[PDB]
């Protein structure tokens with residue numbers, strides 16, 4: 068069955084969110100460096 | 105059923121990939137500034 | 143200027159949804175409380191509707207967004223935003239459109255976990 | 258330091274696996290083509306196997322990454338490692354041809 072598939076996709080999705088988040092953070096650090104100069 | 109759930113989740117994933125790609129593009133645009141100035 | 147508020151809210155909502163044990167009351171109400179704000183951040187300031195073609199001001203960090211069919215038209219939040227005023231600050235912010243789609247699909251999934 | 262390689266490869270790989278066109282013959286083979294390059298970009302340059310714990314140096318575009326043990330952490334990379342793991346889990350789980 069495609070039961071576990073759903074669970075996997077959820078986990079991937081959550082991780083991807085984690086990424087998107089860290090990426091936003093890093094965009095902040097970059098905009099900070101640029102604004103600093 | 106849970107197959108429509110699954111497909112929905114897939115669509116979301118794909119969108120999230122697009123988003124990630126976009127962020128990556130912007131980040132690269134930012135680092136371009138950083139190496140230029142520093 | 144990327145849609146910071148909207149992405150943040152998206153992360154919140156998405157998380158609550160994907161960590162919700164369908165049936166459980168607390169997570170559910172938390173979702174229901176949080177969701178409109180995430181919806182709000184993706185609403186056109188002239189329509190009230192969900193951005194049908196997102197245009198963001200290259201102008202400012204003020205984060206007010208409109209449909210493409212909502213150029214030069216009267217915005218709703220009174221007092222009006224100072225930074226918004228200049229209208230030729232048209233940019234098709236992709237991140238926005240994506241987030242709009244994301245929200246739609248999220249609601250779809252939610253209604254599924256509800257029924 | 259921002260990991261361009263790992264992210265780009267993760268994106269394309271995922272895109273392929275998930276946007277699998279079951280009426281395309283090149284469908285499987287392209288996944289298989291990309292997969293090792295992706296796996297590699299996330300492997301330690303002293304360990305050999307996939308990054309155990311990610312450490313990258315400040316603002317070096319040489320893009321080489323190594324385990325915490327093998328001698329500044331990059332959280333993005335750690336996430337990406339997990340992304341590979343989970344993606345592989347999905348791959349093994351589903352049929353692709």
Ligand SMILES: [Zn+2]
Nearest residue numbers: 186189209212
């Ligand atoms: Zn509108």
Ligand SMILES: [Zn+2]
Nearest residue numbers: 204206223226
């Ligand atoms: Zn404004």
Ligand SMILES: [Zn+2]
Nearest residue numbers: 301304324327
């Ligand atoms: Zn190592």
Ligand SMILES: [Zn+2]
Nearest residue numbers: 317319320321
């Ligand atoms: Zn090196």
